[PDB]
Assembly symmetry: C3
Homo-oligomer: 64 residues x 3
Amino acid sequence: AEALFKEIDVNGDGAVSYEEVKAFVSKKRAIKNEQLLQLIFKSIDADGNGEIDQNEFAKFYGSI
Amino acid sequence: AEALFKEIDVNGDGAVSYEEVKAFVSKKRAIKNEQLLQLIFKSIDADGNGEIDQNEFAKFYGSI
Amino acid sequence: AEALFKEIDVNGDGAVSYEEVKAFVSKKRAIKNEQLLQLIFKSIDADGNGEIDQNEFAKFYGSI
Ligand SMILES: [Pb+2]
Ligand SMILES: [Pb+2]
Ligand SMILES: [Pb+2]
Ligand SMILES: [Pb+2]
Ligand SMILES: [Pb+2]
Ligand SMILES: [Pb+2]
């Protein structure tokens, strides 16, 4: 009755098959990678318009 | 005369080309990942019918 | 005015978009992997003809 078992159990038959654990691990990994990358971007895009201009980029670099 | 050189040497010409080392490293990696994942599954599937029901899943989690 | 911002800024509009940072990180990663692999090959291919014969392969292995 936890959303996690249901999230992994994609065809909803009450059983987590191997393919499902595998698809899950894959997408969980993909998501953590997206989140770290976005967070890094947003962190460089100091003013938040959604693009990094040469200035934001300049600050970001150096002794970093 | 070791099975390993022959395993990497896929077109069998006595020479391991770069593509072959590369294909080999790729598939070796893929296999270690499958094996760890399967072992983890089999380890959760406490009764071995090949699917994880909410119970096996429940035990598995917690302070894990 | 650094080649790096221009290298990431693929469509050249002065702005590094997210897709571009992402494509960049991907290809940077791909390249480091190629370079390490090639260096390892070249390191096994002791005489440099571009293929590893059973002999070069033999030396390479052991207590390695
Ligand atoms: Pb299922
Ligand atoms: Pb900006
Ligand atoms: Pb060959
Ligand atoms: Pb089971
Ligand atoms: Pb751009
Ligand atoms: Pb050689």
